[PDB]
Each structure stands twice: as C-alpha cells, then as structure tokens.
Amino acid sequence: VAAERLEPRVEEKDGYWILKEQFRKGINPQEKVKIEKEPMKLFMENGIEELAKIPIEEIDQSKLTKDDIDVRLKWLGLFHRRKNQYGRFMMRLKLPNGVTTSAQTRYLASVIRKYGKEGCADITTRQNWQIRGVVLPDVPEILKGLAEVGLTSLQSGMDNVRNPVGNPLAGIDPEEIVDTRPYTNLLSQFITGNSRGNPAVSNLPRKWKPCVVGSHDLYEHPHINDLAYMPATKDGRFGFNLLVGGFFSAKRCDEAIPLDAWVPADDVVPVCRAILEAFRDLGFRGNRQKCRMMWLIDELGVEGFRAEVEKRMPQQQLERASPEDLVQKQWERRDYLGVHPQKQEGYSFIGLHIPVGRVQADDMDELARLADEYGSGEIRLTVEQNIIIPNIETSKIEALLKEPVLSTFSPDPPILMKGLVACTGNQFCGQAIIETKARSLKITEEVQRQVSLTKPVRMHWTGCPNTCAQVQVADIGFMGCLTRDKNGKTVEGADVFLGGRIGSDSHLGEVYKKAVPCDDLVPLVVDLLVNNFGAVPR
Numbered sequence: 001v002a003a004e005r006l007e008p009r010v011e012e013k014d015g016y017w018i019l020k021e022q023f024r025k026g027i028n029p030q031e032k033v034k035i036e037k038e039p040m041k042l043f044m045e046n047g048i049e050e051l052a053k054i055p056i057e058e059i060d061q062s063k064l065t066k067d068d069i070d071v072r073l074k075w076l077g078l079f080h081r082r083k084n085q086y087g088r089f090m091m092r093l094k095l096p097n098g099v100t101t102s103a104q105t106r107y108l109a110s111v112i113r114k115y116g117k118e119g120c121a122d123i124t125t126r127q128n129w130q131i132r133g134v135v136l137p138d139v140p141e142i143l144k145g146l147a148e149v150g151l152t153s154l155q156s157g158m159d160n161v162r163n164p165v166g167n168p169l170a171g172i173d174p175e176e177i178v179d180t181r182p183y184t185n186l187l188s189q190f191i192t193g194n195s196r197g198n199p200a201v202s203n204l205p206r207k208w209k210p211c212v213v214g215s216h217d218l219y220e221h222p223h224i225n226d227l228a229y230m231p232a233t234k235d236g237r238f239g240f241n242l243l244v245g246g247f248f249s250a251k252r253c254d255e256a257i258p259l260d261a262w263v264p265a266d267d268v269v270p271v272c273r274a275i276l277e278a279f280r281d282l283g284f285r286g287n288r289q290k291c292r293m294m295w296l297i298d299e300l301g302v303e304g305f306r307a308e309v310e311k312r313m314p315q316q317q318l319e320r321a322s323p324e325d326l327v328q329k330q331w332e333r334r335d336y337l338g339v340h341p342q343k344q345e346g347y348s349f350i351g352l353h354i355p356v357g358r359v360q361a362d363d364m365d366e367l368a369r370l371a372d373e374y375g376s377g378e379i380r381l382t383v384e385q386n387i388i389i390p391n392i393e394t395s396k397i398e399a400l401l402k403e404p405v406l407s408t409f410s411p412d413p414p415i416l417m418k419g420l421v422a423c424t425g426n427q428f429c430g431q432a433i434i435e436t437k438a439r440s441l442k443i444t445e446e447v448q449r450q451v452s453l454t455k456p457v458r459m460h461w462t463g464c465p466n467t468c469a470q471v472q473v474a475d476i477g478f479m480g481c482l483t484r485d486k487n488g489k490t491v492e493g494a495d496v497f498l499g500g501r502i503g504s505d506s507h508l509g510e511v512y513k514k515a516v517p518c519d520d521l522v523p524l525v526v527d528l529l530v531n532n533f534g535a536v537p538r
C-alpha cells in the first residue's frame with residue numbers, strides 16, 4: 001500500500017465533514033447526495049422545520065427536496081416508505097443496550113395511535129424501537145416529544161453508527177461478566193454528540209455497527225458487528241479485546257476478525273473514535289457493495305488498518321490483544337424467556353415473547369403498565385425482538401403470571417416461537433421480495449402443531465438478500481425470493497439456509513435449498529426438524 005493511499009479523504013468545513021475536492025471522482029450517488037447538501041443540517045440547523053411545511057407532492061418535484069425526504073432524513077432516523085406506504089415514515093431510535101422506560105413507551109404509543117391503521121411499532125434485530133405511520137408535517141413535534149422523554153432518533157440510518165447493542169441481562173444476571181450499559185450509553189452519547197448531533201462520525205462511507213459484550217452467552221452477536229468489545233483482562237487490568245469488520249450483505253457475509261488490540265475500559269470511546277476516523281478518512285466510496293469497513297481492512301491488511309487506528313489514539317498508543325478474554329467457551333446459551341432470579345436478592349426479571357416483534361399502541365401501553373406495576377418502569381428489548389421486564393419483587397410474580405396480556409405476550413411460548421425472528425418484509429419495506437411477519441408466524445404455528453422438540457431451534461425469516469433478520473446466524477433461515485409453483489405461476493418462496501451457530505462457537509449458515517414455494521415450507525421444515533434437530537412427530 002502506497003503512502004498516498006493513507007491521505008485523509010475528508011476534511012472539516014464549517015462544522016461538518018466533507019469529501020475533499022480531489023477525492024470526488026467516481027463516487028456513488030449517495031456520496032453525491034451528501035455533497036449536494038449536508039444531511040445533519042436538517043437537525044443541527046433546524047432545516048426540518050421549513051421542509052416539513054412543504055406538501056409532499058411539491059417535495060417530489062425537485063431532486064434536492066426529494067433527496068431530503070428519501071435519503072437525508074435517515075440521519076434524523078426517518079425512513080420514507082415510498083413504495084409500500086407512500087408519504088409515511090418509519091422512525092428508528094437510538095436505544096443503547098435496548099433499555100426503555102414506561103414513559104418513553106407510552107410516548108411512542110401515543111405517536112403511532114394517531115395514525116390508526118397506518119401506525120404500529122416493531123422491535124428490531126438491534127434491540128431497538130421502530131415506529132410507523134409518521135407524516136412529514138408532524139416531524140418537528142415528534143422530535144420535540146422524543147427529546148422531552150429522553151429519546152433521540154439521530155444517526156440511526158444510512159452512513160452512520162447504528163444502535164449500540166449490549167447484554168440484555170446487563171446489571172441483573174448473576175452470571176454476567178461486566179455490565180454493558182455504561183459502555184453502550186457512552187458510545188451512544190459520543191455518536192450523537194449528547195443528542196445534538198455529531199458531524200465527525202456522520203459522513204462515513206457506509207453504515208457501521210458496534211456492540212459491547214458482557215455475557216458468556218454472547219447475546220450481543222460480536223461476530224457480526226463492525227466493532228465488538230470483548231471483555232478481557234490484560235496484565236491485571238480490566239478492558240476489552242477488539243474485533244473488527246463483521247458484516248452481512250447480499251454479496252458477502254464476513255465474521256469480525258481480531259484487530260490484535262486491547263484497550264483499558266476507559267478507552268472504549270477513544271478507540272471507537274479512532275476506528276471511525278480511520279474508516280471515515282480512508283474508506284472506498286465507489287460501488288456501495290464494497291464500502292463496508294471490512295473492505296478497507298482487506299485493502300490495507302489488518303496490520304495496515306491497525307496502524308491507522310493507532311495513529312488516531314491519544315498519545316498514539318494501542319496495546320496488542322490480551323492472549324485470553326473473559327468469555328468462557330464452556331457455555332450453553334441460556335433462555336431468558338420466563339421468570340429468572342436477579343443478582344439482587346428478592347428480585348426477578350421476566351422475559352416475554354413478542355410474536356415477530358410487532359406491537360400496536362394498546363399493546364405498548366399494557367407493557368408500560370406492567371413495567372410500572374410490577375417492575376421499576378423499565379422495559380428492555382432483545383435482538384430476538386422480545387422484551388424483558390426487570391426489577392420485579394419476586395413476591396409479585398404469582399400475580400403477574402395471571403395478567404391477561406401474558407396470554408398474548410407469553411413468558412413460556414412454544415419453543416419454536418421463542419427463537420423466531422423476522423424482518424419487516426413487504427408490508428412496509430420497499431426492498432422486500434416477500435411478506436415475512438405474518439407468513440413466518442403462520443408457518444411456525446403449523447410446524448409446531450406437527451412436531452414436538454426440546455432443542456431451542458432458532459428460525460429467522462428475512463424478506464430480501466439484505467438479511468436484516470440475519471438468516472446466516474439461524475439454525476434454519478428463510479430468505480425471500482420469487483419462485484414458481486407446479487403450473488409455472490409466480491409465487492412467494494424462500495431460499496432455505498442451514499448451519500448458522502451463535503455463541504462462542506459461531507458459524508455462518510449457507511443456502512441449503514433454493515426457491516422453495518412458501519406454501520411448501522411446512523413439510524420441508526417438519527422433516528428438517530425431525531431429521532436434524534431431534535423433533536418427534538405428534
């Protein structure tokens with residue numbers, strides 16, 4: 001790698017970061033959008049106020065404003081559903097470590113309730129909230145309302161640092177390694193500039209995903225993150241070994257690799273900043289399929305990339321990885337659904353199943369009520385799109401289990417439902433090839449009617465090759481496609497994946513059978529479960 005390759009390609013100009021004039025050749029259309037107008041201005045210079053007043057039919061008549069609503073608004077966490085819900089916006093938060101409050105939950109419910117049949121909410125595979133139905137004129141008031149209840153939606157889409165994932169059992173599990181909340185909180189505060197916006201990390205070549213590990217279970221999926229902090233002691237000091245570059249895409253899925261770096265716990269934010277600066281400064285900005293950070297690591301080599309991180313650390317110091325980390329390889333991933341004792345004597349948490357992560361306003365209010373009556377007003381989201389209500393006096397559990405809403409959001413659903421994960425799909429997503437959430441529920445119900453089993457088989461349904469529902473981590477994965485029935489008629493189908501493993505002995509699954517009509521999946525899956533997962537016909 002020539003020394004010229006290491007010249008930073010962006011510069012700070014009037015508070016924002018922009019591609020230098022000599023590096024603008026050959027860039028992709030999204031890079032052109034960012035140059036034409038700085039997306040962060042919509043928030044930081046309150047550009048959204050005037051934009052929100054323009055009727056959407058008028059907005060669509062000019063490239064600048066159409067790009068504002070279809071692209072730049074994703075820096076404020078707003079996602080125009082142009083194809084499938086025209087004129088409505090999905091809104092995505094920052095929710096470090098998946099932690100929410102009852103007050104926040106009620107606020108989100110009040111927003112979606114306004115939109116009737118156009119509104120609902122979802123828990124995401126990054127233990128985050130999305131709300132639906134938002135109209136542009138309401139955006140300024142919603143931004144204000146979110147701020148009032150201690151939420152931000154900043155920098156949650158496009159070329160930004162995505163939700164910081166942590167241990168859903170942080171602070172409450174007798175078996176945790178380290179409470180991840182302080183670290184994910186710090187990362188979120190850094191990324192968003194304490195909810196004011198942070199332009200230094202908002203002009204990346206591509207999205208970038210961080211997680212902090214605190215569980216032996218590896219609930220955080222460090223193997224598939226751009227930056228994973230693995231807790232490790234080095235020379236008698238607590239800190240983290242760093243894994244880099246994990247990502248999924250239509251083209252390529254790669255597990256994170258060691259940076260060969262350890263940082264003391266207090267250096268979590270400094271090293272996040274150094275890695276982001278290196279990626280920002282040096283990353284390819286051509287073909288979008290070659291812009292994730294792993295591509296930079298392959299171009300420079302991991303050592304070349306490491307040197308770039310090191311030069312951006314305070315005092316330019318970056319220690320080598322500790323030979324061992326604190327994560328025990330002898331471990332069985334634990335079910336968190338149901339009632340479990342906390343490390344605080346006399347308290348329990350309860351994991352509740354949320355079918356395919358989908359809730360309505362009334363459901364959110366009920367969950368918020370439970371958290372107030374039984375817990376401490378806290379609701380935690382998980383990456384399997386479920387919830388945990390912590391801090392429940394154990395004496396209250398008997399009464400809790402009789403609550404009617406627990407028949408719908410159950411502490412002990414059938415085993416296949418416990419592990420079922422599904423993305424948005426074509427109900428709302430314009431990229432989706434098939435419908436996912438309703439279909440996956442229907443198929444899983446029919447499968448479980450036919451077989452019993454004891455192994456916690458994890459089934460993931462994703463609507464297109466972007467693999468937001470991570471089919472490559474599943475015991476059985478389903479990737480949306482169009483295929484043909486026996487008569488040659490177009491029908492929805494799935495490419496079926498096998499081989500995904502999570503925890504310390506992680507592995508990426510691969511396509512097992514292509515183009516199976518969705519209507520034909522039940523017998524295929526029943527047989528797979530019996531033949532490979534010890535299932536028994538009923």
Ligand code: SRM
Nearest residue numbers: 090124125126128163247248249423424428429466467468
């Ligand atoms: C909501 C969510 C799936 C869910 O049902 O849970 C989702 C939904 C979408 N993702 Fe994703 N992604 C979700 C996690 C993922 C993950 C899983 C993860 O983070 O562990 C991945 C695979 C891992 C990765 O990215 O490395 C993922 C890979 C993508 C990709 C392909 C990335 C690539 O490098 O090619 C895209 C397309 C893109 O960004 O260019 C994408 C694009 C999209 C968009 C924003 C596309 C769009 O504008 O319509 C989807 C919005 C649909 C909607 O209305 O909800 N989504 N997406 C997840 C929100 C996470 C969050 O709260 O921040």
Ligand code: SF4
Nearest residue numbers: 423429432463464468
């Ligand atoms: S995997 Fe495809 S269909 Fe599903 S939410 Fe992601 S982009 Fe949409």
Ligand SMILES: O=S([O-])[O-]
Nearest residue numbers: 157158162207468
């Ligand atoms: O929007 S997806 O990348 O989480």
Ligand SMILES: [Cl-]
Nearest residue numbers: 074157158159
């Ligand atoms: Cl996006």
Ligand SMILES: [Cl-]
Nearest residue numbers: 081082083430
């Ligand atoms: Cl769309």
Ligand SMILES: [K+]
Nearest residue numbers: 354357384385
């Ligand atoms: K779920």
